[PDB]
Design a protein around this nucleic acid. Structure first.
Ligand code: MG
Ligand code: MG
Ligand code: MG
Ligand code: MG
Ligand code: MG
Lengths: 141, 313, 227, 78, 77, 142, 103
RNA sequence: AUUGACGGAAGGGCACCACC
RNA sequence: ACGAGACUCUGGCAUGCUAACUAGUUACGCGACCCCCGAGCGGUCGGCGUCCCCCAACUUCUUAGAGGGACAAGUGGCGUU
C-alpha cells in the first residue's frame, strides 16, 4: 500500500516536486488542475507528457506537484520535468523495467529536457558594466 | 562435437559488466553487476527476439558495482561497490535491507558462506573483514594480511576444513582458516597481480589468475601445486563448472575452457568480427558464470553486453 | 544579559579588537622583536600571548613592563580587573618570520649601517635559517634625492595562486630617516615539513612525489608453506 | 585547450617507468593505482596524470615511445 | 638520556623553583642553571636530568606552555 | 464536488462580484467614485462597480493563504509606478480601500479576525465561495 | 534533566567540525540522546570597496568577504554532565553558547 | 661588433577594450 | 626556476552516507467546506496536532559537511600515426 515515489525537476531556480502514488488518473499542481496553470499560452508544454504517453499510462496513478522558486516559465518547465521523471521512476520501481524503457525512449526521443535538467544558471555581474559580459560605454577625447 | 555457440546477447547496460551471478533455485533469472552503478535482475525469456529482458534494476551504490552474489535460497543478493559499502538486497521488493559500512576504501569483492550465516569481503585498503547477516563487522584480519589490495575472496563449499581463499595484487594466494581467522597456507607462485580466485564445486581444487596470463591450480587439502595453464592475455575472471570437469577463463577478448583431465583447450570462444578497421582492441570479457544445470555460460563484456554461450553435443 | 549583539557585529568587533591590539603592540614593542599576538579565551582569565624574539625586555624589569601593558590593555578595552593576563613567548625560529626580520632590518637601518650590507646580512640569515627563498625590497631615497628601489632575491619565490597564502609570509615596514622615509618589504618562502611547526604541512599542489618501488625479486617455480 | 602540461607528462612518465607492471589500459584502475603510489595533492591533477598514463599505455603496446625506458627492452631479442 | 632543555626562563627563577616544579613528577638527579658569568641570574636556559628517561618523557608534554612567571616556557629534549 | 481552486479564477472573481452586488448587504464608502486605488495609478477605475470586484478578489485571496492584513493586502494589490523621467519602482496599494473592503466583508459575516493577527475566512465564507465556484464550474460545462 | 542546546559558531569549517566531533563522541560515550549537528545557513558578510586610495584608475573593485558557520547540538541530560562533556580543548576560532532550556 | 628603441621597411601570430 | 597551468572560491550532479520543531515531506487523527441516491483509502486546506517523548516514520524537496564524479576517458576520421 506504500506504492509512492517523490521525484523532482528543476529549471533555473525553480524546483517542482511531483509525488506519484497509486490512484485513479488525477494530476494536480499546487492543488489546481493541470489545465488551469496560469501561463495558458504555454499550456501544451504542461500537457506534453500526457499527450505523448497517452492516458492509460497515467490512469493508474495519482500525481500531485508542488512547485516553488523561479518565474512562471521556469515553473512550468519544472512541472513538465517533474511529472515525466515521476512517472518514469514509478514505472521503474513498481511495474517493470521494459515499460520504463519504452516510456523513457518516447519522452527522450521527443525532448531530452523531460528527464535531464538544464544546467544553465545566471552569471555573476562584474564591476565594469551593467551585467555579466556587457561593459559601460567608453569615451575618447 | 561438444563445442559451444553464441545463443544471443543481453543488452541494457551502460558500463562494463564486472560480475554475473546465478542460483540453482531460479533457473530463469541471473544477476549482472556493472559500472553504470546499477545491478540488473534479468528474466530469461528464451525467444527469437531477445534471449533476456531487464526485469528489475537496483540503484543503491554511488560508484561502480564490483561484485554481486545470490544467496542459497535465491532471495537475498549481496553486492559490493567502489564507494566502500556492501548492500544486502531483497530481490522481491528490489530494495536493500542492510548496508555494511565498515570498509574505508573500494570493495573489490564479496562472498557468501554455503549456509549464508557469515559473509566476507575484500577491498583496496588491504584488509579482509568478516561480517554477519545482521550488519556488524565481526572480525577484521590485519596480521600477515596482503601487502597490497585484495581482489577476490571466496569461501569453500565443503564441510571439512571450512576455509577462506583469497588473492591480491601482491602476487600471493592466502588460505585462511575460518574457525580462528588465522592464516594457514601461503602460496607464492604467481608473477603478476591476481584478479580472481575460484574454488571447485567438489571442494578439492582452487584456481588463480591475473596479469601474467597464466592460471595456477592449487590443492586445498595439502596446499600443493598441481600444474599451471597458460592463457593468451590477462585473466580477468575464472569460473569452474558444476556438472563437468572444466575450468573456464576470460583471457583478454576470448574465453578459454581448459579441461582438467587431458589438460587441453576444448574450445576458445571468440566474439564475431566487428570494427573491421584494425585501429582498436576488441572488448574484453570481464566475468563468467555457469548455470546450475551447466548448459549455459554467461559472459560479461566491455561493450556493455552480456553474451550467452550454449554448449552443444 | 542586557547586552546582546548579532553574530555579524560580534565577529567583526572581535576582529577589530584583535587588529587594534596588534597595532598597539606593534607600535609599543617594535624594538623588542614583536612578531604577533594570539588571544586565548579561558573560563577564569583572558590570556594575551605575545610572540617576541627578545621576550625579556617585553617582560621588562622584574615584570614591570608586562604589568604596565596589562594595565593599559585592561583600561582601554574595558575588561574586568584581574581578568586579563599577558604572557610572552619566544618565537621558535626567527629566520622564518618576515615581521621579525623586517623589524631587524629596520633597526639595523636606524643605527648607522649601509643599506646594502644590512639587506645582504638579513638575506643571508634568512637563507641560512632554512628558507627556500627570500626577497627583500628597500625603496626610498637611497642614493641622493631621486628615489629608487633595490631588491635582493635568493632562491624560490612563488607569487600567484592560493599557495602564496600559506607558503609565503610578508611584512611591510617604514624607517623614518633624516632625509625621508624608507619602505622595507620582506617576504620569505617557508620550507615544506610534514607534522612540523617550521612551515606548512600540505605540499605544493603541483609537486608530485612518486614513492620508490620496493625491490621485487621474482619467483621461479611455485612454492607454498604450510604454517 | 586540452594540452597537458610538463608536470602531468613528466609525472606520468616517471609513474610508468617505475610501475609499468601495475597499469593497464583502464582509466579508473590507473587512477586508483596512481592515487596509491604517488602523493598527488589534488584530484584534478590525479585525473589528468591518470589520463595521460592511460593514453601512454595505449602506445606502449604499439612500440617503444621516445622518452620511456622500461624492462620491455629486454624482451626485444629480435 | 633524560635530556630536558627548559627555555624562556625568568630572572627570578633559581634552582629551587625548577626543583619544586618538576618534583610532582618524581625525583631529580642534576639541575643545571645556565647562570650569567660574574652576574647572578639565568641566561634563559636550563638543563635537567630527571634520573629516569620515562617520567621526563611524561613531563615534557606536561609543563609545556603553562605561562610560568608571565613567560610561556618551551621544554624540549 | 467543486472548490475554488478547481475553476478559472478570473471568471470566479466576476461571478463572486456579481453575487456580492446582487445581495445588497455589502457596505460601500461614500468616496468610491472619487479615489484612485493606489498612489501609482493615473485615473480612477474604469468600472463603476469596482468595489464589489475588489471585495470578491480579496475574498478569494483570503480563501487561499488566509491570515492576512491591510499591509499584505496592499502588497498584493500594489503594482509599478512610473516616476516621469526617473525609473519605475514597485509601490503598494492604498490602505483605506483595503481596510474598508475587509471591514465590509467582516460585516457580511464572511471574514473574521484571526487569532495570531490578521483576517481569515469564516465557515460561511468558505461555504459561499465554494457554492459560487460550483456555479461557475457548472455554467462552464454547457 | 533539561533540554540543553549548545550553539557553536566559527569562521572556519575544519576546527568547527572537529570540535563538533569531539562533543558528539564524548556525549555518545556517556549514553546521551544526542540530536546531532544541525547546520544553519552560513552567513556571508560582503564588503565591496574601491581598490584605489585616491580616485584615479580603471575603476576596479575589491570584494572582501567573511563566512560565518553555525552548528547546533541538543543534549537531554543533567547540567553537571554537560559541564564535563564540554571543557575539552576548544579550538581558538570556535565560540560556544550553552542555552539551558531557558534564556 | 653587441644589446635596446625606432623605420611614413619586409614577413608571421593574437584580441568583439579590433574587424567581419 | 618565476609567470601560464596547477591552486582557492563559485555553478551544475548524487532517491548513495551524516543528520535536523530555528527546514520540511509523507502517513495518521481532529476540524471546516463542497458534491451524494446513503455515497468515498473522494477533493481543497501555508487549518490544528503527533516535542508531555512515542501517543508516526523519514530526509525526496531545504540546509551543509565528508567523500564520489570528467580524464579528451570510449568509438570513428585527420595529423609526421
Ligand atoms: Mg541584465
Ligand atoms: Mg607557478
Ligand atoms: Mg593561475
Ligand atoms: Mg501586484
Ligand atoms: Mg560592426
Amino acid at each position: 500500500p506504500l506504492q509512492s515515489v517523490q521525484v523532482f525537476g528543476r529549471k533555473k531556480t525553480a524546483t517542482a516536486v511531483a509525488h506519484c502514488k497509486r490512484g485513479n488518473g488525477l494530476i494536480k499542481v499546487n492543488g489546481r488542475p493541470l489545465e488551469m496553470i496560469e501561463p495558458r499560452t504555454l499550456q501544451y508544454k504542461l500537457l506534453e507528457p500526457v499527450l505523448l504517453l497517452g492516458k492509460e499510462r497515467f490512469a493508474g496513478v495519482d500525481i500531485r506537484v508542488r512547485v516553488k522558486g523561479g518565474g512562471h516559465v521556469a515553473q512550468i518547465y519544472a512541472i513538465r520535468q517533474s511529472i515525466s521523471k515521476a512517472l518514469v521512476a514509478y514505472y521503474q520501481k513498481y511495474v517493470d523495467e521494459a515499460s520504463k524503457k519504452e516510456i523513457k525512449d518516447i519522452l527522450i526521443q521527443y525532448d531530452r529536457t523531460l528527464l535531464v535538467a538544464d544546467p544553465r544558471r545566471c552569471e555573476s555581474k562584474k564591476f565594469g558594466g551593467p551585467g555579466a559580459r556587457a561593459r559601460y560605454q567608453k569615451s575618447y577625447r | 562435437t561438444e563445442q559451444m555457440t553464441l545463443r544471443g546477447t543481453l543488452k541494457g547496460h551502460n558500463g562494463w559488466v564486472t560480475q554475473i551471478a546465478t542460483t540453482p533455485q531460479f533457473p530463469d533469472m541471473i544477476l549482472s553487476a556493472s559500472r553504470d552503478k546499477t545491478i540488473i535482475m534479468w528474466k530469461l525469456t528464451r525467444d527469437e527476439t531477445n534471449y533476456g529482458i531487464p526485469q528489475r534494476a537496483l540503484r543503491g551504490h554511488s560508484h561502480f558495482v564490483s561484485d554481486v552474489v545470490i544467496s542459497s535460497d535465491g532471495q537475498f543478493a549481496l553486492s559490493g561497490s567502489w564507494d566502500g559499502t556492501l548492500r544486502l538486497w531483497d530481490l522481491t521488493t528490489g530494495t536493500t535491507t542492510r548496508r555494511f559500512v565498515g570498509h574505508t576504501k573500494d570493495v573489490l569483492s564479496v562472498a557468501f558462506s554455503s549456509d549464508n550465516r557469515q559473509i566476507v569481503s575484500g577491498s583496496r585498503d588491504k584488509t579482509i573483514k568478516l561480517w554477519n547477516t545482521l550488519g556488524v563487522c565481526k572480525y577484521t584480519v590485519q596480521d600477515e594480511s596482503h601487502s597490497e589490495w585484495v581482489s577476490c575472496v571466496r569461501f569453500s563449499p565443503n564441510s571439512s576444513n571450512p576455509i577462506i581463499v583469497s588473492c591480491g595484487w601482491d602476487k600471493l594466494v592466502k588460505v585462511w582458516n575460518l574457525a580462528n581467522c588465522k592464516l594457514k597456507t601461503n602460496h607464492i607462485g604467481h608473477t603478476g597481480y591476481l584478479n580472481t580466485v575460484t574454488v571447485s564445486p567438489d571442494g578439492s581444487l582452487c584456481a588463480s589468475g591475473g596479469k601474467d596470463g597464466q592460471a595456477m591450480l592449487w590443492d586445498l587439502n595439502e596446499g600443493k601445486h598441481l600444474y599451471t595453464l597458460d592463457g593468451g592475455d590477462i585473466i580477468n575472471a575464472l569460473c569452474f563448472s558444476p556438472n563437468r570437469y572444466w575450468l573456464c577463463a576470460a583471457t583478454g577478448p576470448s574465453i578459454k575452457i581448459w579441461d582438467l583431465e587431458g589438460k587441453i583447450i576444448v574450445d576458445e570462444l571468440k566474439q564475431e568480427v566487428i570494427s573491421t578497421s584494425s585501429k582498436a582492441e576488441p572488448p574484453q570479457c570481464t566475468s563468467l558464470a555457469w548455470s546450475a544445470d551447466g548448459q549455459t555460460l554467461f559472459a560479461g563484456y566491455t561493450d556493455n553486453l552480456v553474451r550467452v554461450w550454449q554448449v552443444t553435443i | 544579559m542586557a547586552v546582546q549583539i548579532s553574530k555579524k557585529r560580534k565577529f567583526v568587533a572581535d576582529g577589530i579588537f584583535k587588529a587594534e591590539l596588534n597595532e598597539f603592540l606593534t607600535r609599543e614593542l617594535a624594538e623588542d622583536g614583536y612578531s604577533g599576538v594570539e588571544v586565548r579565551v579561558t573560563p577564569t582569565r583572558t590570556e594575551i600571548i605575545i610572540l617576541a624574539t627578545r621576550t625579556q625586555n617585553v617582560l621588562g624589569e622584574k615584570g614591570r613592563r608586562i604589568r604596565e601593558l596589562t594595565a593599559v590593555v585592561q583600561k582601554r578595552f574595558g575588561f574586568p580587573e584581574g581578568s586579563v593576563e599577558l604572557y610572552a613567548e619566544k618565537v621558535a625560529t626567527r629566520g622564518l618570520c618576515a615581521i621579525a626580520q623586517a623589524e631587524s632590518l629596520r633597526y639595523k637601518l636606524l643605527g648607522g649601517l649601509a643599506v646594502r650590507r644590512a639587506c645582504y646580512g638579513v638575506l643571508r640569515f634568512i637563507m641560512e635559517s632554512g628558507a627556500k627563498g627570500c626577497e627583500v625590497v628597500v625603496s626610498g631615497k637611497l642614493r641622493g634625492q631621486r628615489a629608487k628601489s633595490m631588491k635582493f632575491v635568493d632562491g624560490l619565490m612563488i607569487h600567484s595562486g592560493d599557495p602564496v597564502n600559506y607558503y609565503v609570509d610578508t611584512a611591510v615596514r617604514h624607517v623614518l630617516l633624516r632625509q625621508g622615509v624608507l619602505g622595507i618589504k620582506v617576504k620569505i618562502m617557508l620550507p615544506w615539513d610534514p607534522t612540523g611547526k617550521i612551515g606548512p604541512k600540505k605540499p605544493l599542489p603541483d609537486h608530485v612525489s612518486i614513492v620508490e618501488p620496493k625491490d621485487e625479486i621474482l619467483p621461479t617455480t611455485p612454492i607454498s608453506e604450510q604454517k | 585547450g586540452r594540452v597537458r602540461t610538463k608536470t602531468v607528462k613528466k609525472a606520468a612518465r616517471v609513474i610508468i617507468e617505475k610501475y609499468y607492471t601495475r597499469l593497464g589500459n583502464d582509466f579508473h584502475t590507473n587512477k586508483r593505482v596512481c592515487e596509491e603510489i604517488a602523493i598527488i595533492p589534488s584530484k584534478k591533477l590525479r585525473n589528468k596524470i591518470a589520463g595521460y598514463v592511460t593514453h601512454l599505455m595505449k602506445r606502449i603496446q604499439r612500440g617503444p615511445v621516445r622518452g620511456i625506458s622500461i624492462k620491455l627492452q629486454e624482451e626485444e631479442r629480435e | 638520556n633524560a635530556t630536558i632543555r627548559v627555555t624562556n626562563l625568568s630572572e627570578d627563577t633559581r634552582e629551587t623553583d625548577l626543583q619544586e616544579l618538576f618534583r610532582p613528577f618524581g625525583s631529580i638527579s642534576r639541575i643545571y642553571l645556565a647562570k650569567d658569568k660574574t652576574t647572578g641570574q639565568s641566561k634563559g636556559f636550563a638543563f635537567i636530568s630527571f634520573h629516569r628517561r620515562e617520567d621526563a618523557a611524561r613531563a615534557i608534554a606536561g609543563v609545556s606552555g603553562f605561562g610560568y612567571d608571565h613567560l610561556i616556557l618551551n621544554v624540549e629534549w | 464536488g467543486v472548490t475554488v481552486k478547481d475553476v478559472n479564477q478570473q471568471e470566479f472573481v466576476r461571478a463572486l462580484a456579481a453575487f456580492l452586488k446582487k445581495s445588497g448587504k455589502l457596505k460601500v464608502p461614500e468616496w468610491v467614485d472619487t479615489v484612485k486605488l493606489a498612489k501609482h495609478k493615473e485615473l480612477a477605475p474604469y468600472d463603476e462597480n469596482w468595489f464589489y470586484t475588489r471585495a470578491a478578489s480579496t475574498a478569494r485571496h483570503l480563501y487561499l493563504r488566509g491570515g492576512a492584513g491591510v499591509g499584505s493586502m496592499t502588497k498584493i494589490y500594489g503594482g509599478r509606478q512610473r516616476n516621469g523621467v526617473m525609473p519605475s519602482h514597485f509601490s503598494r496599494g492604498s490602505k483605506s480601500v483595503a481596510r474598508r473592503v475587509l471591514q465590509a466583508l467582516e460585516g457580511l459575516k464572511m471574514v473574521e479576525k484571526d487569532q495570531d493577527g490578521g483576517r481569515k475566512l469564516t465557515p460561511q465564507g468558505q461555504r459561499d465561495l465554494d457554492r459560487i465556484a460550483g456555479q461557475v464550474a457548472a455554467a462552464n460545462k454547457k | 534533566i533539561h533540554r540543553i542546546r549548545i550553539t557553536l559558531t566559527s569562521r572556519n569549517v575544519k576546527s568547527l567540525e572537529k570540535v563538533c566531533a569531539d562533543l558528539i563522541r564524548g556525549a555518545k560515550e556517556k549514553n546521551l540522546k544526542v540530536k546531532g549537528p544541525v547546520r544553519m545557513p552560513t552567513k556571508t558578510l560582503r564588503i565591496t570597496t574601491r581598490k584605489t586610495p585616491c580616485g584615479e584608475g580603471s575603476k576596479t573593485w575589491d570584494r572582501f568577504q567573511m563566512r560565518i558557520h553555525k552548528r547546533l547540538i541538543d543534549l537531554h541530560s543533567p547540567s553537571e554532565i554537560v559541564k564535563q562533556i564540554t571543557s575539552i580543548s576548544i579550538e581558538p576560532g570556535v565560540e560556544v553558547e550553552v542555552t539551558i532550556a531557558d534564556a
